[PDB]
Design an enzyme around this catalytic site. Structure first.
Site, PDB file in Angstrom:
ATOM      1  N   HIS A  15       0.827  -1.195   0.000  1.00 48.03           N
ATOM      2  CA  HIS A  15       0.000   0.000   0.000  1.00 48.03           C
ATOM      3  C   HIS A  15       0.870   1.257   0.000  1.00 48.03           C
ATOM      4  O   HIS A  15       0.342   2.363  -0.077  1.00 48.03           O
ATOM      5  CB  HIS A  15      -1.057  -0.031   1.109  1.00 48.03           C
ATOM      6  CG  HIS A  15      -0.534   0.087   2.497  1.00 48.03           C
ATOM      7  ND1 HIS A  15      -1.041  -0.673   3.528  1.00 48.03           N
ATOM      8  CD2 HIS A  15       0.411   0.888   3.041  1.00 48.03           C
ATOM      9  CE1 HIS A  15      -0.406  -0.339   4.649  1.00 48.03           C
ATOM     10  NE2 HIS A  15       0.483   0.605   4.374  1.00 48.03           N
ATOM     11  N   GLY A  63       2.003   5.697  10.380  1.00 46.97           N
ATOM     12  CA  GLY A  63       3.438   5.644  10.155  1.00 46.97           C
ATOM     13  C   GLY A  63       4.042   4.333  10.646  1.00 46.97           C
ATOM     14  O   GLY A  63       5.213   4.083  10.381  1.00 46.97           O
ATOM     15  N   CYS A  70       2.986   1.306   9.790  1.00 49.20           N
ATOM     16  CA  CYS A  70       2.918   0.303   8.739  1.00 49.20           C
ATOM     17  C   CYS A  70       4.326  -0.128   8.328  1.00 49.20           C
ATOM     18  O   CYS A  70       5.234   0.694   8.175  1.00 49.20           O
ATOM     19  CB  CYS A  70       2.148   0.819   7.527  1.00 49.20           C
ATOM     20  SG  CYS A  70       0.492   1.465   7.900  1.00 49.20           S
TER      21      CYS A  70
HETATM   22  C1  LIG Z   1      -1.265   6.503   3.111  1.00 53.62           C
HETATM   23  N1  LIG Z   1      -1.466   5.055   3.053  1.00 53.62           N
HETATM   24  C2  LIG Z   1      -0.757   4.277   2.057  1.00 53.62           C
HETATM   25  C3  LIG Z   1      -2.301   4.425   3.979  1.00 53.62           C
HETATM   26  C4  LIG Z   1      -2.241   3.071   4.158  1.00 53.62           C
HETATM   27  C5  LIG Z   1      -3.023   2.438   5.090  1.00 53.62           C
HETATM   28  C6  LIG Z   1      -3.899   3.143   5.882  1.00 53.62           C
HETATM   29  N2  LIG Z   1      -4.714   2.481   6.833  1.00 53.62           N
HETATM   30  C7  LIG Z   1      -6.058   2.152   6.379  1.00 53.62           C
HETATM   31  C8  LIG Z   1      -5.936   0.794   5.755  1.00 53.62           C
HETATM   32  C9  LIG Z   1      -4.891  -0.142   5.705  1.00 53.62           C
HETATM   33  C10 LIG Z   1      -5.314  -1.252   4.963  1.00 53.62           C
HETATM   34 CL1  LIG Z   1      -4.226  -2.708   4.734  1.00 53.62          CL
HETATM   35  C11 LIG Z   1      -6.593  -1.280   4.418  1.00 53.62           C
HETATM   36  S1  LIG Z   1      -7.312   0.236   4.850  1.00 53.62           S
HETATM   37  C12 LIG Z   1      -4.252   2.160   8.075  1.00 53.62           C
HETATM   38  O1  LIG Z   1      -4.947   1.626   8.942  1.00 53.62           O
HETATM   39  C13 LIG Z   1      -2.818   2.493   8.440  1.00 53.62           C
HETATM   40  C14 LIG Z   1      -2.619   2.524   9.950  1.00 53.62           C
HETATM   41  C15 LIG Z   1      -1.910   1.455  10.475  1.00 53.62           C
HETATM   42  N3  LIG Z   1      -1.678   1.353  11.781  1.00 53.62           N
HETATM   43  C16 LIG Z   1      -2.114   2.257  12.643  1.00 53.62           C
HETATM   44  C17 LIG Z   1      -2.838   3.341  12.219  1.00 53.62           C
HETATM   45  C18 LIG Z   1      -3.248   4.273  13.177  1.00 53.62           C
HETATM   46  C19 LIG Z   1      -3.987   5.372  12.765  1.00 53.62           C
HETATM   47  C20 LIG Z   1      -4.278   5.552  11.400  1.00 53.62           C
HETATM   48  C21 LIG Z   1      -3.855   4.619  10.449  1.00 53.62           C
HETATM   49  O2  LIG Z   1      -4.171   4.845   9.147  1.00 53.62           O
HETATM   50  C22 LIG Z   1      -3.116   3.490  10.848  1.00 53.62           C
HETATM   51  C23 LIG Z   1      -3.966   4.516   5.702  1.00 53.62           C
HETATM   52  C24 LIG Z   1      -3.156   5.158   4.780  1.00 53.62           C
END
Ligand SMILES: CN(C)c1ccc(N(Cc2cc(Cl)cs2)C(=O)Cc2cncc3cccc(O)c23)cc1
Ligand SMILES: CN(C)c1ccc(N(Cc2cc(Cl)cs2)C(=O)Cc2cncc3cccc(O)c23)cc1
EC number: 3.4.19.12
Lengths: 301, 305
Positions: free
Chosen positions: B41, B143, B145
């Site tokens: 992603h 961040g 991820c």
């Molecule tokens: C900018 N980009 C590439 C991005 C990738 C993933 C996300 N997502 C949404 C999804 C991930 C998947 Cl797999 C399917 S939907 C995430 O969940 C990432 C994430 C991971 N852990 C803690 C977090 C805490 C707060 C907010 C977050 O976004 C968090 C958002 C943006």
């Protein structure tokens, strides 16, 4: 989101752990530059341990008396000196894995990471707090002595604890890295016991703020309290007094959450009166006191 | 004495963490030999997360489109390919900090250490279980991820988890290092929720053995049970079934404590029906289910790495 008992990454400390052997006693040592730090009881036989005269025991020691091993390599000890209850072994070669480091002494309530080791080798890493009674509730077996507690803020590692002793209650005692014991303990096998332990109130409030930050609200209430009334109630549950300093320290969490410190004290008071009613907070069914305000802030942002 | 949630020493893994940037998205990557692994992603904008065709998105990318930073030092990306939901970036240099490692896929109930990272820098380490519903209850901010989970077996690091997402329930989802998701999830912004979770029964028993080893033993009783009776009650309490394999795996602890597994199941059965009765076990007011039998052994025998 989420809240976990988090330790610091242990890599920088793992590079400093060595095995120290003197006679039939083997424990852990911490290798920084050209010095290996370890509990001075390494020079004791267990028969010596009742009333050891460490100055007398040490002067009788030769460098050849200490076997220091970093994995395959035996380090050669140039000299030995004693600083309070830690022995310093000077060695021929400096440790190339030595990180940026400082020795700090912590106050009760403060948290740190413990790298538990056996025979110079890491078994695992966990989080600890210096208890009000100056013990730590650790996980330590014989051979653990010399394991260190640290925090890593910036690249610099602050060593705050070295493990020396397990008390009869199963809790643990040790020194700062200048060999000064935390608490009134002594490195003798004489009868010692920890004072009654108490709950670190300011850390509990910090953890309640952490919960609210993670979207828990169930324990909140519409009351406030005076500090004095709070403390009179908290004391009755063997909780530490909350000072004005603590109130100031919790200020930024109150600001971030929009819940006033004394509002949150009122919630805690009620939680003590009622328990959890089968509920949990941040996945725990008791009130957690081993996260500082600073810990909550680090983990939540 | 004492019993803590204990992570593996994280040093071997700390040496592999890098920052990966593609467009405006910066997350963490794992550098092993000449390949950097990260969530695919990374190529998505948050808008693109809504519907992505990862193959189509990928071809559009050039190697110079991915910016890989190992602290101060930039890594030059030779090539790229995708494997399931993880992107692999070939790089000019092999990692001299690369440890002895393998990629393993863990089963539910199994525990591991997570090294939480931001911008390629390790921030913190904690112990976690793969929940029966294939979520992990972790601590992750945006961040995070690309952060990984691992076990150390002998001197071998087993990578079992890479972090991708937070579910709306606050719990977390991710993949093995071959990009295969744990649990019925997908890497797009879309309606996804955790299935109902259950207690990892074998781990609860293991933690009860740990308590008795630490002299916490008030819950012990005179009774025994059958697997059938246990399981029929356990099922009613949203506890996982206990298999014969589970019983075998707890064998050493039974032997060391002199409490037989089904004797201990009888205690657990009572704890389910009656609650704690105002008492704690190993300082906890819950029945703790994120310690495996082997965890209890490792901690109580002081195994090192
Ligand atoms: C900018 N980009 C590439 C991005 C990738 C993933 C996300 N997502 C949404 C999804 C991930 C998947 Cl797999 C399917 S939907 C995430 O969940 C990432 C994430 C991971 N852990 C803690 C977090 C805490 C707060 C907010 C977050 O976004 C968090 C958002 C943006
Ligand atoms: C042979 N030798 C040098 C030795 C050093 C220390 C000890 N002691 C006793 C004292 C240490 C001090 Cl300081 C004053 S009395 C220790 O408690 C060490 C220890 C530490 N943590 C967990 C343990 C678990 C079980 C048994 C242990 O011995 C443990 C005994 C022998």
């Amino acid at each position: 989101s989420g809240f976990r008992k988090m330790a610091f990454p242990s890599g920088k400390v793992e590079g400093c752990m060595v095995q120290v052997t003197c006679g039939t006693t083997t424990l852990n040592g911490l290798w920084l530059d050209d010095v290996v730090y370890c509990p001075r009881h390494v020079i004791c036989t267990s028969e010596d341990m009742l009333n050891p005269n460490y100055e007398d025991l040490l002067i009788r020691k030769s460098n050849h008396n200490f076997l220091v091993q970093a994995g395959n390599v035996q380090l050669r000890v140039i000299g030995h000196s004693m600083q309070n209850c830690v022995l310093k072994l000077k060695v021929d070669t400096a440790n190339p894995k030595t990180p940026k480091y400082k020795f700090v002494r912590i106050q009760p309530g403060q948290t740190f990471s413990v790298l538990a080791c056996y025979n110079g080798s890491p078994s695992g890493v966990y989080q600890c707090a210096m208890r009000p009674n100056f013990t730590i509730k650790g996980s330590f077996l014989n051979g653990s002595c010399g394991s260190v507690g640290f925090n890593i803020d910036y690249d610099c590692v602050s060593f705050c604890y070295m493990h020396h002793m397990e008390l009869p209650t199963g809790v643990h005692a040790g020194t700062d890295l200048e060999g000064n014991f935390y608490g009134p303990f002594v490195d003798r096998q004489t009868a010692q016991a920890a004072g009654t332990d108490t709950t670190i109130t300011v850390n509990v409030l910090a953890w309640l703020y952490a919960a609210v930050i993670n979207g828990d609200r169930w324990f909140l209430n519409r009351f406030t309290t005076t500090l004095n009334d709070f403390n009179l109630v908290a004391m009755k549950y063997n909780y530490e007094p909350l000072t004005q300093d603590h109130v100031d320290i919790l200020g930024p969490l109150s600001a971030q959450t929009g819940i006033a410190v004394l509002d949150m004290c009122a919630s805690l008071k009620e939680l003590l009166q009622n328990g959890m009613n089968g509920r949990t907070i941040l996945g725990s069914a008791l009130l957690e006191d081993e996260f500082t305000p600073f810990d909550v802030v680090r983990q939540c942002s």
